[model samples]
Target: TVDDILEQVGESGWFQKQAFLILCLLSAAFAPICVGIVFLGFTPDHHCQSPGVAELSQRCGWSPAEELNYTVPGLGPAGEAFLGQCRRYEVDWNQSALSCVDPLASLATNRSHLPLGPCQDGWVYDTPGSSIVTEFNLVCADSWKLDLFQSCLNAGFLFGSLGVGYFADRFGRKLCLLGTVLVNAVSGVLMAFSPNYMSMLLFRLLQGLVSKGNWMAGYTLITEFVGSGSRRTVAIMYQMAFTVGLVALTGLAYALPHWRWLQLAVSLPTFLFLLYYWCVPESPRWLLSQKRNTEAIKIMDHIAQKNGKLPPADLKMLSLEEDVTEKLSPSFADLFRTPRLRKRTFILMYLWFTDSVLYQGLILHMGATSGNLYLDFLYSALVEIPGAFIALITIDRVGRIYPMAMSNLLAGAACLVMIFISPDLHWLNIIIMCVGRMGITIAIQMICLVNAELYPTFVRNLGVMVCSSLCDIGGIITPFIVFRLREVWQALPLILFAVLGLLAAGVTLLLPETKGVALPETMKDAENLG
Candidate 1:
């Protein structure tokens, strides 16, 4: 019966206009999170030849990478990832020990070395956007700072997930969603105009707070509007929107090379969603739980009308039979109170962390490769659509545990094979990396999907939030892992990825299988896995 109602709603909502509007709000509100990732294309991780280097190459027959390697200080084989100090060395070329300064001035005396002179003890990067990230040469002099930038955002997600999620449940999802939208938009704009890297990282953190909260609100709203059977369909479709957002992100970033403009472009649309404060109503289910029966009836009538039907004459508010007082407030203890949950929680968390590391490492590092980075990254992402389809078909049939484990294992093997295979074989590495990407993408997406199924209704949101927080945790560590490890060996990140992926697969065996199993209703129900 619940399945039938949910199917009707999920397949076709009662209020098409309202549903479309809310979905748009959610998607637009979520754009910043995805775009920040896509904007890595313009981040200038590696240095390019300056005018000086280009000029020198014209006079002398130097290969492009060679000219870049020599003139872009600290861009030698080891330091080629980013630029060094602005000048060649410290000394002024006009009166110097190293002929570093007016080297540019030597050609044209107009460009004197004032701030460019020696002893500043800093470097400047040739960044693509009007971004201070490169102004300070964080790419070279302080790559870890960039790691911290992403880390702060994930840190925000961790705290915001618990706090905002509680507030959303206690108060209402609509207002909370709107409030997060307002903050997210403001902070995103401020981040784009940040005067310094620290300011930039700070606003980025604020951006994350709203970002995660908004996602939770949308996630909760969609399920509440649907019935049991349709809930899965709606939830999965909502997540599928995120995948669509990723595709949009690739095209947008390519079109807008400047990060600030890109940030503004992504965030400004949120202002439009503020109109939803009047248009979208609070969840009637949520109101019913809070005992606002009259308000709930009115909202339900609205929904029935939208569905081109009228509320049943005897329709009454739902009681949700269980004692509300017994529901546990989400805290660290509930996670480990039982063996099955403890195991699932830990494994899911680790898997989340590992997925973030591998996925980010793949995309971010792909941009630094020699070929057409845009086309390469886009092609890699194109594979993700099929990956999602395969996941959709197999996850329900094969169950959560095995397909997930196999996905991780396949990715790990792919990464290993890619590393061992000579990189000189570009096509081979490309093929292998795509496989790894597909495997990890499917595994990570499936992890989020099925993790909720393993938890009780009372704590499902909490479980998903807490478990996926590790995803943000992984995101925090990923940049450092990939960039830092690469300093040791170009292939080191991949090898580390293989180790983590294999370990994830092995640990997955410890989780209970969940195929054709009804969703859990309580912690006692969750214990069935034990």
Candidate 2:
């Protein structure tokens, strides 16, 4: 057991404390790329470019609002929605002599019957602070470009989740951590400076490839550093770092509202992390596993000496049963090889999927309903911080299953309740949304907490890796659904969110409760867990 070696090295020692703080920063840095999509790809208020109508409006001495009211088709006296933005009359308004009021009535019997076609020139934006949407004209026919921008990162996350562990295991954790951080920082800066949308996606994909991998590499490093007693506490607080990152990210986005500047702002600090080379050492456990015992001994002594503890005289012959962890060829088939494990595996995968879609779907959908994008994002993000506190208080006291199950059901209820409330109801809707956000936060945290508890030791890490890939998969699809579904209705996405939430709540009940249960060591022990 690494736990055995850990006890000799001063379990939650000075070295581990220093390393944990550094590792936690990786979570904070990864967050903006996670939800910064809301601001960076923000679709602001816009209408069709009245290329010729602008000249007509100037000649008639019409106000901006008056020109918009008379010419725009969507925001009509009789109707609703931004329908006029995509199509316009085929008239040469620059050449025509026209009345400022009811201008189209002179040319056609009815304005609706007139030939309305795609804007030949371009779309004019009510650009406040520039985003990728405004800079690239990613609207109307090209709006799908915005969706794909976010998806590229998710696709990278999906691919990297599978490959990263293998990369780390093959190369060693310190090298993987160092390598991914360099790649992540370079790719992020390149993403900001990308000259075209194509290159931006390519760089953003590169960032996604390594940033998610970079986060996990640090995650493994710290967990390996700590004691058995300290591991759960580290895991609990480690998950909270992203929410902390988000709260700061909201302020950063508010300060640097331009998408390119915001991209650079979030990404630039990552360069400082490269100094981690001098700050920490390779995992001693990893070194020992690779049969480099002398190097492992040197590090262990250095770590114990730093932690203010001298090594025991009997510390020379150190080995771990965890070598069995490396030697076992873990297969996905082993995950479903038993009925109890299979039932748990299937349920956990859906829970991961549910958390991903709802967590991200809400972030993307917030842009449309935002009163102040910064405050709304900040308020919703702030609630996520309390989720960690709530889980810490309730998980052991209440046990794992109910907190996980009820949180899902509560989130579903909040979504269902939001549908009937008129948008005019205002803050009440935001309050309900906050409750739903809290619900998903707890459910996600609980899923991470319980996932390891459910699997037997042989495939424990493999199970988490495979299940969490579902999160990236859900992330890939959420952009299209959230962005495109507004064509049907404003809150259409929330309804599906409610349905997934409720379904996941039911499936969570079928899993065996893990609280106070012994860690499963064998296939037979895992099979009878229920």
Task: Return the TM-score for candidate 2, rounded to 2 decimals.
Answer: 0.83
Q: Across residues 1-530, which tens digit of lDDT does each residue of candidate 1 receive? A: 22333343343564644674466457644745744654552355444324344445565666645545445444434434322433343323223213332134433432243233322434434444544454556544465576576677788888887777666755677777877888887888787777777787788778777788788677766655555444445555665666656566667667777777777777755776665456667765455445566786676666676677656654554333453543545556778897667878988888888887778776665544566545755676577777777877776567678888999999889978877787586877777777888888888767766676677555656667778887777776787677788888988888888898899889888877766555554456678953
Clashes of each: 4, 0
Report model 1's TM-score to 2 decimal places.
Answer: 0.79
| Candidate 2 total steric clashes | 0
lDDT of each: 0.65, 0.75
Per-residue lDDT over 105-131 for candidate 2, one digit per residue giving the tens place of the 0 to 100 score? 634553566667776677787755888
Error of 1 at 274 (Å): 1.9
lDDT of 2 at 199: 94
Q: Tell how far residue 37 is off in model 1, in angstroms.
A: 5.5
- Candidate 2 overall Cα lDDT vs. reference? 0.75
